Design a protein around this ligand. Structure first.
Ligand code: PCW
Ligand code: PCW
Ligand code: PCW
Ligand code: PCW
Ligand code: P5S
Ligand code: Y01
Ligand code: Y01
Ligand code: LPE
Ligand code: LPE
Ligand SMILES: *[C@@H]1O[C@H](CO)[C@@H](O[C@@H]2O[C@H](CO)[C@@H](O)[C@H](O)[C@H]2NC(C)=O)[C@H](O)[C@H]1NC(C)=O
Ligand code: OJ0
Ligand code: NAG
Ligand code: NAG
Lengths: 120, 1272, 171
């Protein structure tokens, strides 16, 4: 698969800002008209994926009810960075975080899995 | 002392230490025969059983004082070590120490290490190792650690003098081990790259490779001056090209009509795609780059609605430009190596104009050929010394009667001749195989092959029963023939390759052929006396291939879409080992620029540049060293053949002798049996006409008429109908010249007589030309002007310039040299044809009828193999759809002649890639090719390049240079390429470079002029001026395309300051050296150079201010190159080679005059023949045979054989739908748009052969002779 | 390939005459759809009246007593890209003397581009009763015999002169 550098497990104290890093490596130059980004969240291994962040020629956020307005971005496609923020993380936010990356002309699709753990 | 073998003991160590203490209290070279690593002299005799592989006392008296002990193995080798305690832990007498030397000296240890290294290389070949290779890597690391640690225990690490670290190969081993241990503990392509350094240990392990590597190092050391001169010439030519063609390759045709208020600047920003650029710039069909244009009349033209503009990127991913000094240097190095140089030639001509071909002519002749020949001369001279030094030191019952009868049958002058004739008949018979066959032809071929193999097996069995098998397997030819017989029987019992193995029996003719034996000597010398050099070459190629794979395979696989529109791997890549090896081999053949472009696109500029330059330099050095080594070991050995010529009375000769004995016995009896059964005025006229013909005025008039007639020939192009007056004038001048030449012929007839006129070859040539002219004139007068071969006879008017051959003495002497070399040239050409016949027959057996394919003719793309697998399907597509063709490859292996053409294309590396792609894609007859289905057919082409290209080129050069040397020595030691008058100038201008002493410019009497004179004569002044010249050169290199306005002014002022300083130096040299400054030629050169510098600066200022002329401004500004040409003064290495070039200049002028005459004749022929062929492949709107200039450009391009396949390709098609035999061609009465395959093939093959014989051979032999002269 | 050869300016009464009009494309590999229009201004007349028009492989002939049945197509055939716009006159008359204009309308086809060009060629026809012989051939043919005679005279003069010198030494 694509070179996607993903931390295995992320633990962040409850009630604090959590930086969730997702990054990749590929040939070519980043094209805004072509970049496709999946941002999925799951409450468990078998839980259904939920889309919260998106990139269709720009940054598009779906404003999920379970996340309210706590989801933010700190990446720019040029530096191969697509990391996302969760301000004021909650115990409900514990689960599985995933970032699929699709950067044409590269036909391979990235896949980076993070299991977020929230401490007391 | 034959009995000097004493065990090393503590008493011996104490005695050595005591002597050292005596020497130290009182305060020569080692014997070569006893030095470590070689064999002990035979004078010592056999080693005692208790002395071998044991610590023994030193034998060299020089080492007797110091503490050194010796160990000798059973292989009779001298190993020297240090008696000091290794690491101050173990003594030489230590128990484990003794075992350490015992296992260190064994040859089994060396065998084990070699096996481990070979297995390591084999595993290095893999690109995706499986999971279980980790254990094998651990085993290799452990074996290497064990091998190194044994050496550490015996000889010590660093403290002594015969220790581990003192050997550089041990340095390499230690670096390998530490870099292998570092990775596993630390725990990417760079890291696995270091693994190739294990393969470099083969040089140390395998005996004899160290000496070869050392000799290669010395050969490199002898190329310092040539390398410096090459760098200087490349830099000067790159500066010239940067001044001339800066930004010219950015010319594009931008559309005139723009919508939505768009502009060039507006549209240039939002364009990142190939299609978007296609929408605004003109592209040719299936082209990756926008079409180049120019602002001149002789440049390329834009389609209606487009205008030329300098914008965008340069062609070939932007890597081809003269924008910066570095890109210009890359372009000039590419020109010097002549790698794809015709593409740059055509691009530059299209962008700048056809008048700029003079730059390419100068670069190719003065720079490319000359520097390469200099490199060859220097390397060959270095190898000659090395070889001289090497040889100089070396010099210092009933069945018994049955087999007796069979032995009587073996009687040679008939049976051996019969077998030779059968071999010749068999190889002729197998050459009749071709793809389109009837069944009866195939059956008769099979029957003939079966009969021939039966005859050969019968002769084998007859010899085996005549002479017993014990000494039957003694002659190499006999075991060879048994091998062929066994292989043929095995093939009969059971691929396509196996059938052609019997072709090797053609080599049996070497016993009588003295040149086939030369070829076999060259071939066997590579794996014999020069086997170590070939092994080093193979190891180097393997290392380069593995390095390329490990460095760029993943980059190729993951960055595919940057170098391929289909996002798939290209034809040439470094993903796996086989393709990386193919790329390395292609680089060794001289083709590196395009694969380097792909590498730089997928993996970065710096890494690919470094790797490709290293591969080029090292591999070219090794290949060329092997080439000269073979050429000198096989050819220069023609000084003494101790054995007599064919001790068996020349077995074939007795066959001829026995036959002519019967012929003489028959001829004498046949004649006998028939006889038994049965005046003053005439000689005055002769003398007067003799006086007329040899008069100088008559000769000058005839020469002028010849030149005028050739110039008139050069006028009949496709545009002759646009100029009616010139056409009429030429038609009447034709009759005038015919009258003049008929009169000249009659005068020479009356003034020489029939005997002398018709015993002269030049007179015969002139007579034949005038007869063809007279027949043409008679046919034109009588009205029989357009029937039968009369147009073809008119076409032969292009041979008229041959009349100038006998009127210029330089061309006459070059033609005489060619004629003298003709016999050996024909002999070696016949040998090379015989050798290439085997390869052509093999290619016919492999690739007959397998190059056909469905193609979608709209884009020329082959249909997949999922749909239309095979031919019936192509016809189905022909009805199912349109623009579908079942198309062959024009040049293929369909028959032996087409195979010869394909092998000529492969040997010259021109058009070979298409043939290789077709061959590796081949599946079967009437089957659609699959991409790299027969991938390992590349091996066929590799073997052919090794044998039919490398070895045949070796034989060609050797024999031709031998013939030239024989011609030179026959005349008494004079150059065979220079006229009698040229020799006097040669002697005088050779003496011009030998006057060592001169009067030392007496100092002026007065004060200030003396006080600046002594400043002039100081060497520090000259060094400072040289440094200033180098700085001016640098300021020239820093220029680039679109730099700035501030940078332009700064550079202009820096150049002005440099000009002022140089003029001041010249003037201050004139204040001193009163009128003595003009004595030295170099001072005259400096004075003239500063004059041109000042004049050019002022003229460029005037042109830029008061005038408008960019091209002429650039040409004028090119004059500042003269300032940096003064760098030659302070260089003895460069001056000597340039003196050799000036030595060779006259012979080069004569050879170039002959070459230009041949080019003129071929240009007239091409204008006559190929002026209307279809514009495809190498012939386009700019490079064709329509006018004289275009034909001259094409012929200059193919003089180096560059792109002759592209020029030949559209002439090969002669039938629909490949052409239109009824094309209209508005403005002319000619119909049809395709050429004659026979005429075109003869034209191009003959021209490339003549160019190879003339330019390459002569340039080398004249450069070689002048280099020898100037190196004394 | 294509060469723009100018038309001959002299026509012979009663004979057949071809008026050349060749307009080659700047680049020969480009695709175009071309049609032509011819206008003729007779001598003594001011306006350039139209005579014919050729488009889509069919020649449309206008009303003209001077060209009612004496004009046939002599240009490119079997194509829409016409680089040869020449016409043929099957019976030359005194009314054919004048100035001809050959209007060429070429429509180039490109990737996303369509360019509409126009080329006008002017041809002057002078009808004569007898075909005059060109002055280029008159001088050239005379220059042949002048050079042939002078060169022969030069050779014979030296040959005769050399005989006197050589024969003198014999005696
Ligand atoms: C035994 C040992 C033998 C010698 C081994 C080593 C030999 C050579 C080492 C060369 C190292 C080159 C390093 C380059 C570094 C680099 O990154 O350089 C960048 C510059 C400028 O690139 P750009 O920004 O215009 O590219 C824009 C992108 N684009 C082109 C697609 C439009 O590259 C340039 O100017 C290209 C400069 C190329 C100069 C010629 C290379 C050497 C040729 C022959 C040497 C003699 C044989
Ligand atoms: C150092 C070594 C250098 C070697 C340089 C080699 C340069 C290349 C040489 C030759 C290239 C061309 C060879 C011929 C190609 C023919 C292609 C072709 O079309 O093949 C088929 C045709 C036959 O026509 P068809 O199939 O319609 O059947 C007609 C009969 N019907 C209708 C009854 C079936 O074949 C023909 O005509 C064949 C006629 C010609 C036969 C040539 C045989 C070999 C002779 C010379 C070559 C070597 C020259 C050596 C000296 C210079 C070097
Ligand atoms: C694009 C580049 C655009 C700029 C180009 C600038 C350079 C081009 C042309 C300027 C040429 C200037 C004059 C060269 C000849 C100077 C001269 O006077 O040279 C004399 C020598 C022979 O006398 P010597 O040097 O043996 O001295 C004898 C006296 N003693 C023994 C006391 C030392 O001529 C010889 O060797 C012949 C040397 C021939 C050199 C040709 C160079 C062509 C470039
Ligand atoms: C592109 C690369 C650059 C090409 C152009 C290089 C510059 C052109 C010409 C430079 C030389 C101009 C003439 C200067 C004087 C030449 C001379 O004095 O002698 C010719 C020398 C070799 O003799 P030398 O300097 O060892 O004599 C020393 C005698 N003493 C001891 C009495 C001082 O230079 C020679 O042959 C060199 C002759 C070079 C020109 C001919 C070949 C042109 C192609
Ligand atoms: O040897 C005898 C002659 C040599 O030549 P030469 O001109 O007679 O004498 C030259 C000498 N230096 C001298 O003046 O002492 O050379 C000869 O004598 C050689 C033998 C010639 C035999 C044939 C002569 C045929 C007649 C001459 C040619 C007639 C051609 C006619 C063509 C048709 C009409 C134009
Ligand atoms: C023919 C004889 C003289 C042996 C020639 C051996 C060379 C072909 C080998 C030996 C060591 C090799 C080098 C060993 C290590 C490196 C570092 C390596 O570094 C990287 O890859 C880092 C940068 C990057 O790729 O991101 C690049 C290749 C290079 C220079 C190798 C280039 C090829 C070398 C010079
Ligand atoms: C291999 C097949 C395709 C047949 C090719 C034609 C052969 C029948 C001809 C071509 C070249 C010929 C050879 C050309 C030259 C020689 C050398 C000649 O001997 C010498 O000239 C000896 C000179 C010396 O001893 O100094 C004996 C015949 C031989 C072998 C000829 C034998 C017949 C050959 C092989
Ligand atoms: C299709 C058309 C093909 C045409 C081919 C034409 C080939 C022409 C080859 C010309 C090849 C050159 O001309 C032939 C001369 O070389 C013959 O004379 P020599 O050079 O042997 O004379 C030596 C000097 N002495 C001995 C007389 C004093
Ligand atoms: C060794 C001798 C090697 C000789 C090599 C060939 C010499 C050189 C033979 O070609 C000379 C060129 O200048 C011809 O240029 P063109 O005529 O094509 O330029 C365009 C047309 N106009 C603009 C001039 C009309
Ligand atoms: C030529 O190509 C076809 C492509 O499959 C070969 O196979 C036959 O194709 C036809 C048409 O698609 C099918 O109807 C047949 O059933 C296929 N044959 C078989 C064995 O199933 C065809 O055999 C090829 N012709 C030859 C002579 O090899
Ligand atoms: C022996 C001096 C020649 C040295 N040197 C010159 C340069 C090319 C290689 C070598 C060379 O020519 N050898 C050579 C010999 C020796 C005889 C006949 C044919 C050839 C090619
Ligand atoms: C996000 O999700 C889709 C799957 O629903 C995936 O194909 C792609 O990576 C993203 N969207 C698109 C259409 O690019
Ligand atoms: C110039 O550009 C504007 C858009 O920026 C456009 O609306 C306007 O019509 C254009 N005018 C011309 C001169 O084409």
């Amino acid at each position: 698969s694509m070179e996607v550098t993903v931390p295995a497990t992320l633990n962040v104290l409850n009630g604090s800002d959590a930086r969730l890093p997702c990054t990749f490596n590929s040939c070519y130059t980043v094209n805004h008209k072509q970049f496709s980004l999946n941002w999925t969240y799951q409450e468990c291994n078998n839980c259904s994926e939920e889309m919260f962040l998106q990139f269709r020629m720009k940054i598009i956020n779906l404003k999920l009810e379970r996340f309210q307005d706590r989801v933010e971005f700190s990446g720019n496609p040029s530096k191969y960075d697509v990391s996302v923020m969760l301000r004021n993380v909650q115990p409900e936010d514990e689960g599985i975080y995933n970032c699929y990356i699709m950067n044409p002309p590269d036909r391979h699709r990235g896949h980076g899995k993070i299991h977020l753990q929230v401490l007391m | 002392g034959p009995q000097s073998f004493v065990h090393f003991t503590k008493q011996s160590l104490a005695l050595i230490e005591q002597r050292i203490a005596e020497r130290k209290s009182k305060e020569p070279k080692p014997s070569s025969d006893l030095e470590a690593g070689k064999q002990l002299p035979f004078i010592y005799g056999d080693i005692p059983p208790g002395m071998v592989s044991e610590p023994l006392e030193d034998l060299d008296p020089y080492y007797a004082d110091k503490k050194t002990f010796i160990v000798l193995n059973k292989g009779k080798t001298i190993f020297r070590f240090n008696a000091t305690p290794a690491l101050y832990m173990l003594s030489p007498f230590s128990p484990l120490r003794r075992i350490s030397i015992k296992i260190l000296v064994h040859s089994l240890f060396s065998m084990l290490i070699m096996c481990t290294i070979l297995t390591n290389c084999i595993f290095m070949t893999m690109n995706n190792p499986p999971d279980w290779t980790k254990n094998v890597e651990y085993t290799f690391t452990g074996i290497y650690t064990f091998e190194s640690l044994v050496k550490i225990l015996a000889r010590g690490f660093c403290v002594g003098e015969f220790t581990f670290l003192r050997d550089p190969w041990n340095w390499l081993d230690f670096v390998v081990i530490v870099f292998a241990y570092l990775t596993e503990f630390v725990n990417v392509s760079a890291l696995r790259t270091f693994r190739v350094l294990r393969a470099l240990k083969t040089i140390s392990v395998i005996p004899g490779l160290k000496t070869i590597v050392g000799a290669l190092i010395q050969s490199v050391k002898k190329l310092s001056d040539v390398m410096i001169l090459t760098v200087f010439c490349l830099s000067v030519f790159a500066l010239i090209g940067l001044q001339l063609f800066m930004g010219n390759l950015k010319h594009k045709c931008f559309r005139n009509s723009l919508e939505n208020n768009e502009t060039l600047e507006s549209i240039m920003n939002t364009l990142e795609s190939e299609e978007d650029f296609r929408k605004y710039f003109y592209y040719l069909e299936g082209s990756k780059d926008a079409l180049l244009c120019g602002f001149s009349t002789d440049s390329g033209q834009c389609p209606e609605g487009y205008t030329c503009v300098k914008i965008g990127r340069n062609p070939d991913y932007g890597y081809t430009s003269f924008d910066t000094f570095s890109w210009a240097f890359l372009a000039l190095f590419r020109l010097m190596t002549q790698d794809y140089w015709e593409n740059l030639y055509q691009q530059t001509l299209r962008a700048a104009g056809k008048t700029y071909m003079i730059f390419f002519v100068v670069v190719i002749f003065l720079g490319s050929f000359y520097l390469i020949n200099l490199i060859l001369a220097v390397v060959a001279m270095a190898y000659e010394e090395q070889n001289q030094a090497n040889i100089e030191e070396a010099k210092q019952p009933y069945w018994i009667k049955f087999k007796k009868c069979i032995y009587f049958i073996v009687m040679d002058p008939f049976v051996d001749l019969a077998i030779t004739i059968c071999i010749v008949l068999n190889t002729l018979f197998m050459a009749m195989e071709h793809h389109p066959m009837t069944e009866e032809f195939k059956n008769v071929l099979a029957i003939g092959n079966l009969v021939f193999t039966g005859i050969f097996a019968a002769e084998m069995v007859l010899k085996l029963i005549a002479m017993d098998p014990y000494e039957y397997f003694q002659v190499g030819w006999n075991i060879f023939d048994s091998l062929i017989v066994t292989l043929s029987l095995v093939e009969l019992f059971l691929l396509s390759v196996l059938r052609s193995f019997r072709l090797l029996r053609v080599f049996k003719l070497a016993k009588s052929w003295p040149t086939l034996n030369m070829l076999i000597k060259i071939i066997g010398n590579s794996v014999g006396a020069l086997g170590n050099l070939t092994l080093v070459l193979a190891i180097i190629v393997f290392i380069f291939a593995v390095v390329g794979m490990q460095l760029f395979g993943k980059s190729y696989k993951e960055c595919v879409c940057k170098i391929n529109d289909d996002c798939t791997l290209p034809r040439w890549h470094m993903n796996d080992f086989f393709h990386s090896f193919l790329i390395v081999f292609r680089v060794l053949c001289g083709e590196w620029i395009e694969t380097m472009w792909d590498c730089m696109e997928v993996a970065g500029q710096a890494m690919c540049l470094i790797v490709y330059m290293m591969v080029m330099v090292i591999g070219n050095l090794v290949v060329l060293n092997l080439f000269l080594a073979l050429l000198l070991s096989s050819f220069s050995s023609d000084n003494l053949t101790a054995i007599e010529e064919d001790p068996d009375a020349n077995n074939l000769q007795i066959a001829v002798t026995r036959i002519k004995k019967g012929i003489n016995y028959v001829k004498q009896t046949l004649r006998e049996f028939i006889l038994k059964a049965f005046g003053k005025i005439w000689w005055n006229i002769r003398k007067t006409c003799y006086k007329i013909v040899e008069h100088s005025w008559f000769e000058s008039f005839i020469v002028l008429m010849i030149l005028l007639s050739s110039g008139a020939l050069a006028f009949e192009d496709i545009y002759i109908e646009r100029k009616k007056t010139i056409k009429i004038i030429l038609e009447y001048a034709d009759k005038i010249f015919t009258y003049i030449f008929i009169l000249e012929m009659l005068l020479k007839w009356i003034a020489y007589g029939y005997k002398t006129y018709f015993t002269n070859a030049w007179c015969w040539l002139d007579f034949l030309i005038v007869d063809v002219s007279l027949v043409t004139l008679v046919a034109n007068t009588l009205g029989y002007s357009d029937l039968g071969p009369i147009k073809s006879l008119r076409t032969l008017r292009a041979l008229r310039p041959l009349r100038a051959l006998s009127r210029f003495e330089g061309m006459r002497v070059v033609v005489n040299a060619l004629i003298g070399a003709i016999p050996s040239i024909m002999n070696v050409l016949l040998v090379c044809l015989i050798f290439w016949l085997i390869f052509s027959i093999m290619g016919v057996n492999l690739f007959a009828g397998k190059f056909y394919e469905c193609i979608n003719t709209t884009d020329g793309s082959r249909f997949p193999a999922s749909q239309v697998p095979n031919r019936s399907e192509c016809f189905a597509l022909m009805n199912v759809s349109q623009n579908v063709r079942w198309k062959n490859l024009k040049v293929n292996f369909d028959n032996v002649g087409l195979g010869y053409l394909s092998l000529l294309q492969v040997a010259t590396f021109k058009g070979w890639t298409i043939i290789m792609y077709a061959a590796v894609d081949s599946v079967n007859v009437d089957k659609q090719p699959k991409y790299e289905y027969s991938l390992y057919m590349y091996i066929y082409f590799v073997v052919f390049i090794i044998f039919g290209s490398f070895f045949t080129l070796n034989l060609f050069i050797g024999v031709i240079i031998d013939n030239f040397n024989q011609q030179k020595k026959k005349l008494g030691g004079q150059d065979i390429f220079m006229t009698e008058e040229q020799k006097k100038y040669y002697n005088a201008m050779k003496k011009l470079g030998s006057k060592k002493p001169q009067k030392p410019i007496p100092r002026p009497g007065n004060k200030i002029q003396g006080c600046i004179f002594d400043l002039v004569t100081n060497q520090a002044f000259d060094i400072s001026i040289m440094v200033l010249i180098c700085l001016n050169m640098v300021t020239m290199m820093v220029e680039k395309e679109g730099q700035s306005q501030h940078m332009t002014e700064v550079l202009y002022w820096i150049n002005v300051v440099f000009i002022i300083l140089f003029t001041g130096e010249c003037v201050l040299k004139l204040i001193s050296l009163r009128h003595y400054y003009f004595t030295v030629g170099w001072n005259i050169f400096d004075f003239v150079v500063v004059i041109i510098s000042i004049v050019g600066m002022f003229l460029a200022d005037l042109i830029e201010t008061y005038f408008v002329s960019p091209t002429l401004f650039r040409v004028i500004r090119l004059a500042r190159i003269g300032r940096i040409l003064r760098l030659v003064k302070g260089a003895k290495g460069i001056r000597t080679l340039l003196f050799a070039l000036m030595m060779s200049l006259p012979a080069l002028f004569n050879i170039g005059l002959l070459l230009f005459l041949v080019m003129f004749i071929y240009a007239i022929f091409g204008m006559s023949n190929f002026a209307y062929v279809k514009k495809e492949d190498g012939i386009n709107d700019m490079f064709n045979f329509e006018t004289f200039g275009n034909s001259m450009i094409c012929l200059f391009q193919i003089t180096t054989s560059a792109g002759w396949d592209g020029l030949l390709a559209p002439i090969l098609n002669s039938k629909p739908p490949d052409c239109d035999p009824k094309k209209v061609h508005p403005g002319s009465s000619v119909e049809g748009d395709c050429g004659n395959p026979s005429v075109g093939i003869f034209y191009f093959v003959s021209y490339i052969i003549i160019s190879f014989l003339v330019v390459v051979n002569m340039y080398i032999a004249v450069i070689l002779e002048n280099f020898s002269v100037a190196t004394e | 390939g294509c060469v723009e050869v100018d038309s001959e300016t002299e026509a012979v009464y009663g004979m057949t005459f071809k008026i050349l009009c060749i307009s080659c494309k700047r680049r020969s590999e480009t695709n175009a759809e071309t049609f032509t229009e011819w206008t003729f201004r007779q001598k003594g007349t001011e306006e350039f009246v139209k005579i014919l028009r050729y488009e889509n492989e069919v020649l449309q002939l206008e009303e003209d007593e001077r060209f009612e049945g004496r004009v046939v197509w002599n240009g490119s055939r079997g194509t829409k890209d016409l680089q040869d716009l020449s016409i043929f006159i099957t019976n030359v008359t005194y009314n054919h003397s004048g100035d001809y204009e050959c209007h060429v309308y070429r429509l180039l086809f490109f990737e996303n581009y369509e360019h509409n060009t126009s080329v006008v060629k002017k041809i002057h026809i002078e009808v004569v009763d007898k075909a005059n012989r060109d002055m280029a051939s008159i001088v050239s043919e005379i220059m042949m015999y002048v050079l042939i005679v002078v060169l022969t005279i030069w050779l014979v003069a030296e040959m005769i002169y050399c005989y006197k010198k050589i024969a003198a030494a014999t005696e």
